[PDB]
């Protein structure tokens, strides 16, 4: 079965809204979310619907852009690196679980190319 999704709410976690986090939502998330290959990454992997009974036996730090979107919109993060790490965890999980050349891997690679381009232009913290 599916585990509980990653936390998007935690009142005693300290939160910030920085210019870098604003960029991560307005530029980085927005660019990847609208892409034709975004759909497998817009919500947690559903191991039941996709018939992947081993997915969460293997992937112990799941992450997806639906979770990231919620974290950004609900000001879950303290800094940009936390969010950047979530994106990189999402990509790494996909490359670890799946085989090279699979459709899902080609989709992640295209999203990751855009992610890297946008992260290269991350503004200096103000």
């Amino acid at each position: 079965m599916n585990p509980p999704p990653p936390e998007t709410s935690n009142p005693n976690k300290p939160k910030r809204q920085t210019n870098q986090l604003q960029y991560l939502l307005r530029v980085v998330l927005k660019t990847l979310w609208k892409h034709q290959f975004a759909w497998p990454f817009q919500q947690p992997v559903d191991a039941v619907k996709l018939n992947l009974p081993d997915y969460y036996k293997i992937i112990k730090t799941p992450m997806d852009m639906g979770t990231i979107k919620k974290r950004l919109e609900n000001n879950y993060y303290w800094n940009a690196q936390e969010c950047i790490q979530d994106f990189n965890t999402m990509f790494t999980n996909c490359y670890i679980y799946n085989k090279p050349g699979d459709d899902i891997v080609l989709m992640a690679e295209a999203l990751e190319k855009l992610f890297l381009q946008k992260i290269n232009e991350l503004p200096t913290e103000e």
């Binding site: 679980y97 085989k99 699979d102 459709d103």
Partner: peptide, 5 residues
């Protein structure tokens, strides 16, 4: 095999 196969 494949995720969607």
């Amino acid at each position: 095999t494949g995720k969607f196969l």
